[PDB]
Design a protein around this ligand. Structure first.
Ligand SMILES: [Cl-]
Length: 134
């Protein structure tokens, strides 16, 4: 109930209820108020499940892509971090849920679940995946 499943449970608890804010989620006030961007959301979901993916103030997609172990796209598993080329290389991150979906915090929908086959996310995905819990 920890680790991967715990992070999915915490992160999902606020789906549909947490608008995105670029740069948010790197102060305790923002965390308490559920104000995050894509990478500070992922850091918080895992921290709330007992897993340290980096410092509160300094975690970004660039630091997260350096955590854990590389995974081939064909082998992506629930809990793996999936990265996408949105405004820059690896500019977006989410937590893969299985079944071609991922939990993430994005401008359009805030904290939400998106599909890897949505044409936008399919085009933006380049195969960059990181496993952070074994
Ligand atoms: Cl935290």
């Amino acid at each position: 109930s920890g680790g991967i499943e715990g992070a999915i449970s915490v992160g999902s608890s606020i789906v549909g209820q947490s608008p995105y804010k670029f740069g948010g989620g790197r102060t305790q006030s923002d965390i308490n108020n559920r104000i995050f961007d894509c990478s500070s959301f992922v850091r918080w979901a895992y921290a709330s499940a007992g897993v340290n993916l980096g410092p509160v103030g300094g975690t970004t997609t660039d630091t997260l892509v350096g955590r854990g172990q590389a995974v081939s796209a064909s082998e992506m598993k629930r809990g793996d971090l999936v990265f996408f080329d949105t405004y820059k290389t690896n500019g977006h991150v989410g937590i893969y849920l299985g079944n071609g979906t991922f939990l993430n915090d994005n401008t359009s929908h805030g904290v939400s679940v998106d599909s890897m086959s949505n044409p936008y996310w399919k085009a933006a995905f380049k195969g960059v995946v990181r496993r952070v819990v074994q």
